[PDB]
Design a binder for these strands. Structure first.
Ligand SMILES: [Zn+2]
Lengths: 50, 50, 49, 49, 246, 380, 74
DNA sequence: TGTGCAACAGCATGATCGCGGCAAGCTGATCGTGCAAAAGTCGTGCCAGC
RNA sequence: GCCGC
DNA sequence: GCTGGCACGACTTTTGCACTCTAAATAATAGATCATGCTGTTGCACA
């Protein structure tokens, strides 16, 4: 259980350092929506219409 | 990501270069195997499981 | 489009890299006719260019 | 030299310190690695004289 | 015996790189030894394990002009093979050059020449790549010779057909299910009579379908004949290994 | 963990087919050969320079003799007269004093390159370095009379001597590998001192081996079933790792239960544990257990990190039963350390004291123990 | 200091041969056994060779002949 | 008039998809065995220096 | 992930 | 007379030779785009 939890929280595609240059930059990172990830689509697999 | 459910597509109707539009149906669960229903240029039901 | 252009440049370079001016004059009389580019009633390229 | 020539690098450095400025180029080690890699397959590749 | 300059002579004049197939004898000629243990090094002493992937007896020394166990460790010794360990005193860069070879205790096929859309082995055989793949993995047999019996030279008889032939034909049936079968029938072919017979057929009968296949077969056969290679060298009974430093 | 150290810097070759490739490093001989290439030398001089640079140790000293260098060349007109000249030229390199024959040579070469107006250069140039070096090693009380100088000036002449570098050539040396230990077998203190085995990674290797081999086998894209190609190879790998882990754990358990006296109270309570003692405990040959305990390390709150240390087969014919020399060695170290300023610690007197304590050890046996890691405090 | 070598290029016109000729002359003046035939203005042997070529008193043929004369002298 | 041959459509597989630079980010090894053979070592007693 | 196209 | 590094007979350690012994579960979807070879289908000419 702890192994899976730490694996997800530490080493994952959607888990990354929050940009701390400015307060607004942190806010934008917090409110960010990604189409990639495990259940998402890869970059080259994307197309113009997506 | 894409919500689980049933979705119908037509692959834009340019696969066989004959102007034939091919319609397909797809079922996505939250977890499990997938289900496909397709139409060949000869108009016969085909099922692509997983 | 940047990739599609770089791949084309790679292919062109690889097909054309073995071309060097190795002679002064071959003396051949063959050639090509050159005329101005006139499309319908409008011209784009004069003979001088 | 200045990249993968192991002896060429040192020879060029010594020449520059001596104020000679002569390349004295040799063979890159990457091509030797490639020859070894290809020979490690079933293919025999050699340099003729 | 001093003032030797081996780094300078390492640059030798050359021209016109050539490429060819490697015979087993040619592969053994490169090899400085035989690798027999899949252990590169031991954590008991943190030294390259003997007769392993990373070894000092072959591939050369591991630390300058010193040799293993320290019997001969100086530049005063040159080209000395220690009795306790075959390690030779050397610069130790030789770890990038010496190759080494491993026996296969059974011939295997090169994926380079087997698995390619214009497969040189399959096109040379003329029999389909699917058939070769089935034979190469012991799914089916391919009989060879067998002139007395009704079996053909390149039959694709399966296991049940093999048992039936053994019950009926008994002797005179030579079929192997391994890569040794393909090597055996590759060795038995005579290139000159075969290519000439194909050329005689190609010119006798003309058709736009068979013409391309016949011409390709004549081309490949001449390539092998005009190159000095041997078709049995596609299958390999040995295997060279890379220098450890690479 | 109350506090966690930051991850150490690591790297791996990206956008390169032979992944991780490598990295060249500079050593003492590599940096000395670089200087040889950039100084004006002839062909024979360059050959001699390479010959004597190959013989330079990590400390930067010349391990091989000059006459042996002349022998190695085996060339006419390459006698020691010119070998010495090339040697001095090389000694005057960036790590000044490198490639020196002995300690006197280092100090003499280092003192040659000074202002020549140093307050006590000539006082210590030869008088202390090139002569009466053993006196300077000792208290050198009589050295003041020998050199016809007061003790006051010598008090700073030896200060300059110590200011000179002891072992030149190990400064350029890098030292990136710290040789740290992961301590495969952590043990803790409990009501009975339980022990555990860390860094096994057997479940981690099991999961990866599954997802790779059994994953490919379960993937039904390939025809048939790959139940023997890799499915019965991952099982062998897991069995091998688990067997090794169990053997190591059992052996370490036997060692811990036997040497619990070491961890409890004082450290020097080692029993002379022979290989057969644990061999009978695990009902297994000593050789297999020995190979196992050669480089395996345990993490102790106070104990030493090393399985082989516990063996100490040193019955020493001790008075009541048997004992261990390593414990006896620690006792001797503690006794010799806590003595009078005179500190006699005579091998006869020390042996007599040990025998009075109950350790019947020979007079010379204690001397070898002392000379192992110490020197007699004026016992002669 | 010569920003443009046009004159030197036109003295013997190929734009490739001059680079070599100047390299030969610069080796002569740099390695040893040669002195400039034009005044030296604290500039490097490369531009000295280029200026000598521009002045018309250095070309591949003269390098070949001067070499022959100095070989016959020894 | 039934039959054998050559040309063609559909499918499966392989190969390719720009160039530089900066971060942050990290993989293990296994037997085992008993056995003598060999090497190596420890407790002990020597003779030479102070 | 970002920068210059 | 006192002291400090060299050898010797048991014991101890190392080392090749030596043959070992399941159901789960993970991803597809979402790049096209082009070239080539293999196989089944069909039009054409023959006895
Ligand atoms: Zn050796």
């Amino acid at each position: 259980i702890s192994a899976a939890v730490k694996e997800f929280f530490g080493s994952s595609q959607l888990s990354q350092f929050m940009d701390q240059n400015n307060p607004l930059s942190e806010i934008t990172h917090k409110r960010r929506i990604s189409a990639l990830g495990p259940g998402g689509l890869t970059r080259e697999r994307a197309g113009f219409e997506v | 990501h894409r919500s689980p459910g049933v979705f119908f597509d037509s692959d834009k109707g340019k696969t066989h270069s004959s102007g034939k539009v091919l319609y397909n149906a797809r079922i996505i669960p939250y977890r499990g195997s997938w289900l496909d229903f397709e139409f060949d240029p000869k108009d016969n039901l085909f099922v692509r499981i997983d | 489009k940047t990739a599609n252009s770089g791949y084309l440049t790679r292919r062109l370079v690889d097909v054309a890299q073995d071309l060097v001016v190795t002679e002064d004059d071959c003396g051949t009389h063959e050639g090509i006719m050159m005329t101005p580019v006139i499309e319908g009633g409008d011209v784009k390229e004069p003979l001088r260019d | 030299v200045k990249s993968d020539d192991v002896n060429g690098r040192t020879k060029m450095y010594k020449n520059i310190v001596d104020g000679n400025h002569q390349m004295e180029p040799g063979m890159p080690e990457s091509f030797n690695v490639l020859l070894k890699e290809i020979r490690s397959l079933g293919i025999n590749i050699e340099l003729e004289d | 015996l001093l003032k030797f300059l081996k780094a300078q002579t390492k640059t030798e004049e050359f021209d016109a790189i050539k490429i060819a197939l490697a015979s087993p004898d040619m592969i053994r000629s490169w090899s400085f030894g035989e690798v027999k243990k899949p252990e590169t090094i031991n954590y008991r002493t943190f030294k390259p394990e003997r007769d392993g992937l990373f070894c000092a007896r072959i591939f050369g020394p591991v630390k300058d002009y010193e040799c293993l166990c320290g019997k001969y460790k100086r530049l005063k010794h040159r080209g000395v093979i220690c009795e306790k360990c075959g390690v030779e005193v050397t610069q130790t860069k030789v770890r990038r050059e010496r190759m080494g070879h491993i026996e296969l205790a059974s011939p295997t096929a090169h994926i380079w020449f087997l698995k390619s859309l214009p497969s040189r082995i399959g096109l040379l055989l003329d029999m389909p790549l699917r058939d070769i793949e089935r034979v190469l993995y012991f799914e089916s047999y391919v009989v060879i010779e067998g002139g007395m019996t009704n079996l053909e030279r390149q039959q694709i008889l399966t296991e049940e057909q093999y048992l039936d032939a053994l019950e009926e034909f008994g002797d005179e049936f030579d079929a192997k299910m391994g890569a040794e079968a393909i090597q055996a029938l590759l060795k038995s072919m005579d290139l000159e009579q075969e290519c000439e017979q194909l050329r005689e057929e190609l010119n006798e009968t003309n058709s736009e379908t068979k013409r391309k296949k016949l011409t390709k077969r004549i081309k490949l056969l001449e390539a092998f004949v005009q190159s000095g290679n041997k078709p049995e060298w596609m299958i390999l009974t040995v295997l060279p290994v890379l220098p450890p430093d690479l | 963990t109350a506090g966690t150290p930051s991850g150490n810097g690591v790297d791996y070759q990206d956008d390169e087919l032979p992944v991780y490739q490598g990295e060249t490093t500079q050593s003492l001989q590599d940096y000395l050969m670089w200087q040889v290439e950039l100084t004006p030398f002839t062909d024979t001089d360059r050959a001699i320079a390479t010959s004597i640079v190959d013989a330079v140790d990590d400390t930067g000293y010349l391990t091989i003799q000059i006459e042996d260098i002349v022998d190695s060349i085996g060339d006419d007109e390459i006698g020691l007269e010119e070998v010495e000249a090339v040697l001095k030229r090389i000694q005057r390199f960036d790590p000044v004093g490198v490639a020196a024959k002995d300690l006197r040579d280092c100090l003499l070469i280092q003192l040659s390159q000074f202002a020549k107006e140093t307050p006590w250069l000539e006082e210590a140039r030869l008088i202390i370095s090139d002569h009466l070096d053993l006196l300077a090693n000792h208290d050198f009380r009589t050295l003041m009379r020998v050199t016809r100088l007061k003790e006051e000036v010598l008090k700073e002449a030896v200060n300059l001597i110590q200011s000179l570098d002891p072992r030149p050539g190990q400064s350029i040396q890098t030292g990136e590998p710290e040789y740290v230990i992961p301590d495969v077998l952590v043990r803790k203190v409990n009501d009975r001192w339980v022990v555990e085995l860390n860094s096994d990674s057997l479940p981690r290797l099991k999961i990866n081996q599954q997802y790779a081999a059994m994953g490919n086998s379960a993937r039904n894209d390939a025809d048939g079933q790959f139940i023997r190609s890799n499915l019965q190879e991952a099982r062998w790998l897991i069995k091998s790792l688990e067997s090794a882990n169990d053997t190591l754990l059992r052996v370490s358990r036997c060692i811990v239960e036997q040497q619990q006296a070491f961890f409890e109270q004082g450290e020097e309570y080692m029993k002379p544990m022979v290989l057969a003692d644990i061999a009978q405990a695990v009902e297994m040959h000593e050789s297999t257990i020995s190979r196992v305990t050669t480089q395996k390390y345990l993490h102790s709150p106070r104990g030493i990190f090393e399985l082989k240390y516990f063996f100490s087969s040193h019955v020493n014919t001790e008075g009541g039963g048997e004992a261990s020399s390593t414990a006896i060695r620690a006792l001797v170290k503690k006794l010799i350390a806590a003595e009078n300023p005179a500190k006699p610690l005579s091998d006869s007197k020390l042996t007599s004291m040990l025998s009075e304590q109950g350790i019947m050890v020979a007079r010379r046996t204690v001397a070898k123990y002392r000379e192992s890691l110490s020197i007699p405090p004026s016992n002669q | 200091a010569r920003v443009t070598v046009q004159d030197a290029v036109e003295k013997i016109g190929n734009r490739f041969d001059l680079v070599l000729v100047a390299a030969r002359r610069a080796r002569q003046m740099q390695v040893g056994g040669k002195d400039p035939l034009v005044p030296e203005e604290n500039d490097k042997t490369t531009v000295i060779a280029l200026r000598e070529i521009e002045e018309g008193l250095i070309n591949n043929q003269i390098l070949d002949v001067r070499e022959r004369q100095e070989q016959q002298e020894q």
